[PDB]
Amino acid sequence: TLDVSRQDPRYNTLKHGFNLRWPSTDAQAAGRIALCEKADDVAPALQHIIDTGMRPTVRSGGHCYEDFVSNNPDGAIVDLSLLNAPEVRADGTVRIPAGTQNWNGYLELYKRHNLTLPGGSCYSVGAGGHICGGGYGLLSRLQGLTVDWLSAVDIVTVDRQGRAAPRTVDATRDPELFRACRGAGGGNFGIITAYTFARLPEAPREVALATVAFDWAAMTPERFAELLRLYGEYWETRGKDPDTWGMFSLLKLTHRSAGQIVMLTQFCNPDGTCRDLSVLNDFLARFRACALLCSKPHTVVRYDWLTATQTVNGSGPNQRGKYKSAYMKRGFTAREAQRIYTHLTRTVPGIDLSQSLLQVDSYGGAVNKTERIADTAVPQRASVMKLQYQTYWTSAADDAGHLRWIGDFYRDVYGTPDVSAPHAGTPYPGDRYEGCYINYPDVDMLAYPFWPQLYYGDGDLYAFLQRVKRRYDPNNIFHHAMSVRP
Numbered sequence: 001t002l003d004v005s006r007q008d009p010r011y012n013t014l015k016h017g018f019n020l021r022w023p024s025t026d027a028q029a030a031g032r033i034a035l036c037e038k039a040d041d042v043a044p045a046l047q048h049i050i051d052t053g054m055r056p057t058v059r060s061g062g063h064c065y066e067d068f069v070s071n072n073p074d075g076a077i078v079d080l081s082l083l084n085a086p087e088v089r090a091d092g093t094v095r096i097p098a099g100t101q102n103w104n105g106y107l108e109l110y111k112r113h114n115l116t117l118p119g120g121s122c123y124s125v126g127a128g129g130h131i132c133g134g135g136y137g138l139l140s141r142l143q144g145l146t147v148d149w150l151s152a153v154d155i156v157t158v159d160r161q162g163r164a165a166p167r168t169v170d171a172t173r174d175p176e177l178f179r180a181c182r183g184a185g186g187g188n189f190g191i192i193t194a195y196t197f198a199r200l201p202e203a204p205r206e207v208a209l210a211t212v213a214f215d216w217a218a219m220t221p222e223r224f225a226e227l228l229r230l231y232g233e234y235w236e237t238r239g240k241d242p243d244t245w246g247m248f249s250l251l252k253l254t255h256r257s258a259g260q261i262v263m264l265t266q267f268c269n270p271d272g273t274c275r276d277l278s279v280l281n282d283f284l285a286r287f288r289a290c291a292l293l294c295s296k297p298h299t300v301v302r303y304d305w306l307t308a309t310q311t312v313n314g315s316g317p318n319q320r321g322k323y324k325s326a327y328m329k330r331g332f333t334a335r336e337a338q339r340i341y342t343h344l345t346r347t348v349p350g351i352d353l354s355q356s357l358l359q360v361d362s363y364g365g366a367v368n369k370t371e372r373i374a375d376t377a378v379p380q381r382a383s384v385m386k387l388q389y390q391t392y393w394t395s396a397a398d399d400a401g402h403l404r405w406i407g408d409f410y411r412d413v414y415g416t417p418d419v420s421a422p423h424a425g426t427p428y429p430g431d432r433y434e435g436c437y438i439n440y441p442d443v444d445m446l447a448y449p450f451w452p453q454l455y456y457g458d459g460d461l462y463a464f465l466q467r468v469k470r471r472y473d474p475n476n477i478f479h480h481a482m483s484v485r486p
């Protein structure tokens, strides 16, 4: 372990992660970062921190949207980012240590055994937060969530007597903690050192990437509603069919100041080839090219899968971000389409909303296996679209404008009629929505006493997680603004 305290030249860099908002103040910053050099460092590093009464937060790839890692006033960040070399065995079993970044992981899994894991696209996201939060990406309609493949988890927990020790959890060993590690989100129960997979799916051989853009200059409320109708009605119907599960679409409903709305679709057949583009052609044909809604000319480019996966792996700039999430079981209502149009066309004097957007992901397919409700901590297994509201900016001086823009936008979309008065402002689970995604955490939801039901559903999961919390972190060593409460 390397100790990076405030005397160390690395401190100013290592006190933060990807989102430059955190820590908000120097007072809130960690006093030190414990950079673990091997898995065997983790329990002793943790033991040293808690033995002094200091609080640990936990970092792997640093991508947390919220202050969960970096807001730890004069505490210790236990950093597992150097624990990054996957083990891909000749028998196809895989171990992904927590610091493995998504793209490095895809390269290793692909080259060593023609395997992949259906997680996120961003190159720099770490396994540690990503997988236990229920990570998904462009292959998840085909192959399900990252957590749907997990066979075992190596985790350091702290017992009632305050002793940190490694354990391995799986279907028969601490099975309730295993289930919690399959989606509940990080920084809750202990420090995951590695994820084990008895089997992974084969990497696809070939994909097509289709880009369809729409000029904002021509985008009326009616054309915008037609775009949302065509897209959402597809995922609610045809997109449930298995022959479509290799198709994954990102509709970037940009703020008007971005100039264009962009839809990026990846496609393979279920067998991982592009032997038949019919499903993609049929999907794209719903979006008529100009040369009433009409698009810029469609671009469809074929790649081998690894090459496409590299070309889409960007993380965007290192800057300030605010994010929100919603799971949709249905197409857009006319009221949703109108409220979204309102906020995407709203001018806010003194701030640049050109990087801001509502992203609407195709969802469901192989995710939507109800047997995973009982053995994972991802209860949202009936959604057809997954939404990520995003605003990005450079300067702390502009925080208030950006937070207000995205806060008002979200509250309005999920307001009265489509949502009950008691839950208004949230995509509360029911006939229309399935709530929120813990890997896109939103501390604005702490304003609502029912925030745990947004993330963990209206059923018994949160109480289950509270029981795991009492059993495996009885001292509440591991916490943050949205951690499972004892």
Ligand SMILES: *Cc1cc2c(nc3c(=O)[nH]c(=O)nc-3n2C[C@H](O)[C@H](O)[C@H](O)COP(=O)(O)OP(=O)(O)OC[C@H]2O[C@@H](n3cnc4c(N)ncnc43)[C@H](O)[C@@H]2O)c(*)c1C
Pocket: 017, 018, 057, 058, 059, 060, 061, 062, 063, 064, 065, 068, 069, 080, 098, 119, 120, 121, 122, 124, 125, 126, 127, 128, 129, 130, 132, 133, 134, 135, 136, 137, 185, 186, 187, 188, 190, 191, 192, 193, 314, 315, 316, 439, 440, 480
């Ligand atoms: C920055 C970023 C995030 C993205 C991106 N694209 C995603 C995508 O395509 N699919 C997704 O499903 N999610 C995407 N996300 C969001 C990420 O999934 C989340 O931001 C992950 O939680 C990030 O994980 P990581 O990079 O490890 O982030 P940290 O900030 O280190 O920790 C997050 C969270 O988890 C806890 N924690 C970290 N490490 C551990 C370990 N080893 N054990 C337990 N708990 C751990 C932290 O306490 C914190 O709560 C694309 C981009 C650009």
